[PDB]
Design a binder for this molecule. Sequence first.
Ligand SMILES: C[C@H](CCC(=O)NCCS(=O)(=O)O)[C@H]1CC[C@H]2[C@@H]3[C@H](O)C[C@@H]4C[C@H](O)CC[C@]4(C)[C@H]3CC[C@]12C
Ligand SMILES: [Ca+2]
Length: 124
Amino acid sequence: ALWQFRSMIKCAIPGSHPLMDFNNYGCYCGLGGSGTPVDELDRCCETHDNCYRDAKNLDSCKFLVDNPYTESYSYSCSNTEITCNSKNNACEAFICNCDRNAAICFSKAPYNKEHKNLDTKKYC
Ligand SMILES: C[C@H](CCC(=O)NCCS(=O)(=O)O)[C@H]1CC[C@H]2[C@@H]3[C@H](O)C[C@@H]4C[C@H](O)CC[C@]4(C)[C@H]3CC[C@]12C
Ligand SMILES: [Ca+2]
């Protein structure tokens, strides 16, 4: 679920709490998404959006109001190391992994301040 995703991100990137703020990043980091990713970090979010999209397509899965972000799963954090609980059901496991991959992608991408709260109606 969204809040778990936030938590999962702080795990892989400690000094990140202040960035989940009211803000949004690039063309895909936030909700919706349109046009083309503006950089590596934004591409991570686009990839994550496509991942959720694949989840919504699994005929064996149905999420509340078709929003994978509502799906709560179980996961644990070690030393910035994320582990998805094997007890999660198939649908939850897919989401957990999407969130995990994104968290890892985020930790490796550069953060470009000029993309914070980018005017999406203009540049996306
Ligand atoms: C993980 C990211 C932090 C940047 C950063 O500190 N990089 C450091 C890199 S390095 O260590 O210096 O290499 C932040 C940037 C904007 C954040 C996103 C935005 O705040 C929009 C969204 C807010 C929601 O509460 C959670 C998902 C949501 C989609 C956030 C995921 C985390 C992001 C992608
Ligand atoms: Ca659940």
